[PDB]
């Protein structure tokens, strides 16, 4: 099981998210109270990278999904049979991968030879000078309710910064639910508190 321990490391690495609210029409919205992203299938999910100092050139940013519940965590998170066979390739992503990056031609996908886990990595780009974070646009390509995939089990996304040889520089994580009405579901889940 890949580690999910938060680690800001030397560059002060944190994640940020847009403060999108819960109107019925939002496509992606983040709950700080739950540390949980609610988003729609194949829609843009912005995730911000914030650092206190700039990691060096050749730094990379990897995203991987794991099941949140200890009893499912050893199982590889992948797309259901249906979505795996759907005609929705962007030509870069492997069809079994849950997490894609959109709008980045340098994107690299990995099937880990030993663990069988999937992940997606992009070069780290600094923020524009006087803009304060780097944004990556993720797409989640199955719903949390897909039969034969996640099947309503909750998942985490783990975001790592790594150097050009794959050494760990920083790690954060957040829970994700991929669903039809992220605003409504966020509001409903927050009602429990
Ligand atoms: Zn699916």
CA of 57 to the centre of ligand 1 (A): 36
Per residue, the 3-state secondary structure of 107-132, as one string, reads CEEEECCCCCCEEEEEECCCCCECEC
Nearest to 121 by CA among 91, 88, 157, 162: 162
| Residue 97 annotated as lining a ligand binding site | no
Residue 116 C-alpha to ligand 1 middle, in angstroms? 19
Residues 93/109, Cβ–Cβ less than 8 Å: yes
- Please give the distance of CA 185 from its chain centroid, rounded to a whole number: 18
- Locate 41 and state its tokens: 């299938």
Ligand 1 center to 165 CA (angstroms): 33
CATH number (2.40.40.20, 2.60.40.720, 3.65.10.10, 3.90.1660.10) of 1-193 reads: 2.60.40.720
DSSP assignment of the chain: ------B-TTTT-EEE-------TT-SEEEETTTTEEEE-TTS-EEEEEE-SSPPPTT-EEEEEEEESSGGGTTSBP---HHHHTSS---SSS-TT-SEEE-S-TT-EEEE-TTT--EEEEEE--PPPBTB--EEEEEEE-S-TT-TTTTTT--EEEEEEEE-TT--EEEEEEEEEEE-S-HHHHHHHHHHT-
Six-digit token string for 75: 């199982």
Strand arrangement, sheet containing 99-101: 14-16, 45-50, 134-140, 99-101
Q: What technique determined this structure?
A: X-ray
For the chain, the domains span: 1-193
Instruction: Provide the sign of the torsion angle of the four alpha carbons 81, 85, 90, 94, taken in this order.
Output: positive
| Gap from CA of 78 to ligand 1 centroid (Å) | 9
**Rounded to whole angstroms, how far apart are CA atoms 67 and 47?**
19
Rg of the chain (C-alpha set): 16
Cα separations in angstroms, 49 against 12, 109, 110, 131, 150: 10, 19, 21, 12, 26
Strand order in the sheet with 118-123: 28-31, 36-39, 168-178, 155-162, 60-67, 118-123, 108-111
Is residue 179 annotated as involved in ligand binding?
no
Tokens 């540390």 locate to 35
Nearest residue to 100 (alpha-carbon basis) of 172, 178, 9, 32: 178
Cα 48 from Cα 128, distance rounded (Å) = 13
């Amino acid at each position: 099981v890949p580690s999910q321990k938060t680690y800001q490391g030397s560059y002060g690495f944190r994640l940020g998210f847009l403060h999108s609210g819960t109107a019925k029409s939002v496509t992606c919205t983040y709950s700080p109270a739950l540390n949980k992203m609610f988003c729609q299938l194949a829609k843009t999910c912005p995730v911000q990278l914030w650092v206190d100092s700039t990691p060096p050139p050749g730094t990379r940013v990897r995203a991987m999904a794991i099941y949140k519940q200890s009893q499912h965590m050893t199982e590889v998170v992948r797309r259901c049979p249906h979505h795996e066979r759907c005609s929705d390739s962007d030509g870069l992503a492997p069809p079994q991968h849950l997490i894609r990056v959109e709008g980045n031609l340098r994107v690299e996908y990995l099937d880990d030879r030993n663990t069988f886990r999937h992940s997606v990595v992009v070069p780290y780009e600094p923020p524009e000078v006087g803009s304060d974070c780097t944004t990556i646009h993720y797409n989640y390509m199955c719903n949390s309710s897909c039969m034969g995939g996640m099947n309503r089990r909750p998942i985490l996304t783990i975001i790592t910064l790594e150097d050009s040889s794959g050494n760990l520089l920083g790690r954060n994580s957040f829970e994700v639910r991929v669903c039809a009405c992220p605003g409504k579901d966020r509001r409903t889940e927050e009602e429990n508190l």
